[PDB]
Amino acid sequence: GLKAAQKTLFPLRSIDDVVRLFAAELGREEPDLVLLSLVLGFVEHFLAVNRVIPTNVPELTFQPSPAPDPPGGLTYFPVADLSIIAALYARFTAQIRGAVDLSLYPREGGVSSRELVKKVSDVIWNSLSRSYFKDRAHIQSLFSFITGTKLDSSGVAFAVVGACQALGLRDVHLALSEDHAWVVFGPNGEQTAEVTWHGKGNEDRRGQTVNAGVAERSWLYLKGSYMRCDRKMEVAFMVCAINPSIDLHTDSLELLQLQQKLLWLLYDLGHLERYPMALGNLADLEELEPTPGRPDPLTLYHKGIASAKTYYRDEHIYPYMYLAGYHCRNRNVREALQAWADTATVIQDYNYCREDEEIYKEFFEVANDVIPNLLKEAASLLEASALQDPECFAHLLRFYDGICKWEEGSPTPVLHVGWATFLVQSLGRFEGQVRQKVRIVSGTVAGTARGPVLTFQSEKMKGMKELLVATKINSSAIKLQLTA
C-alpha cells in the first residue's frame, strides 16, 4: 500500500529522522496524512502516554543519545520500525476499502457524492469506541484510532479526511474554525458536511450543512471566514495537534522540540501562511525555548494577525488573544490592554450563541480575572507608570464596548451583574484625573473634503460615557445600565 519512495526513509531513530519524513512527504503532490499521523501518534505514545520501556517486545527498540541540558546522561527515543508502521497503515486501509466500496459512487470527474462523504463519515463514526471520555489526552492521531479506537472531537474530522485520501477522493478537505472541525468537498470545495460532535454534549448535526451556523452569525463558524484546508495545511493541523503533555505539570522535551521544528519546516515551506493559530503556537513555543537565527515571538504573533486580516477578513479572535497573553505574561499592561481591546473589536460583529461557550469563557477570564489582576498588581508597583495613562483607560473601555456590541442582537444575554463588579472595580483602579483626559466623542463631521480619542459603538456603553468619566464612580448606576 505504501510507495517505495516513502519506505526508504525508514526507520526513524530521532526527532530529526522524523522531520525528514515530513519534509519529504511535504514535497509530493499528495502528502500522506495516514502515514504522517501514524508516525506522530506512534512517537507521541511512547514519549507521553507510556514511557516505561517494554523489554519483552523484540520488535520494539529504543535509541540512546546525549541529553539536551547538562542535566541527565542519555535520552531514549522510540525507533519507528518500517514493519510496525506499515502494519498499522495496512490495517487502516483495510477497514476503509473493506467497509466502503466505491463501486456504486459514480464521481463525475473529480468530485465526491454527498452520500459517499456521509458514508466514509459513518464508517469511521461506527468504528469508534463505546467506553471512553471524549476530552482525554493523546487520542487525536490515527495511531489512537487504529490502536484503541479512541479519537477526540477534532481528531474524528481529521480521520474522515484521511480516510477519503485512502479511498482516492482528493476533493474532500478539513475545514477549521477556531473551535470546530468539519469537512468541505465538491467542485471548488464549496459544499460542506458535519462529521464530528461539539462541546460536552454529544449533540451532532451529522449530514447537515454549516449554512445555518454561518447564517446565525455565531463565532463557531466565523461568519463563513473559516479555514478551508489543503493537504499541506492539514499536515500543519496535525503538527499542532501534537500534545506534548505528559502530565498536568510535566511536558515531554522531545515532543516539544519535535513540534517546534515541524512548525518551522512548515513555515519555511510557507505552509503556515494561511494558518494564523499555527503562527501563534509557534510563537508561544519560541518564547520558552528560542532557536538560533529565528525571529522573535513578538515578530510571529504579528505575522499571525497579518494572516488573519489578509486571508480571513480579520474575523479571527485568537491571534489577538495570543498576543495579549504574551504581554500579560511579560507584564506589559499597555500593550496587553491594547490587544484585548482589538479582540473585542472583532467579537462585536458577532452574536453569542449556544455553541460559542468556549470564547465566552475566554473573555470572562480576561474581563473578570486576568485584567483586574494586572491592575491590582499595578496599584502596588507605583506605590513602591501605566495605571495613569488615559490611552489604557480607553483600551479598557473599548474592550467593554466590543463585548457590549457583541451582546446586541444575540439569543442569550452576555452581560450579567457579575460582569459589573469587575467593571466598577477596574474603573476605580484609575484616577479621575485620568478617566477624564479621554475624549469620548461620538462624531464631528463624517467623510473628508477636497489627549486620546474614543468613540463607542454600543448603545449600552454610549449611555454611560458620563458615569465612566465621573470623579465618583456610581456603583449602583453602572450596574443597572450594563444589564438590560
Binding site: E178, F237, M321
Partner: peptide, 9 residues
C-alpha cells in the same frame, strides 16, 4: 493540558 482544540492559545 489534557485536551484543548489544536493550536488554541
Amino acid at each position: 493540558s489534557r485536551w484543548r482544540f489544536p493550536a488554541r492559545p
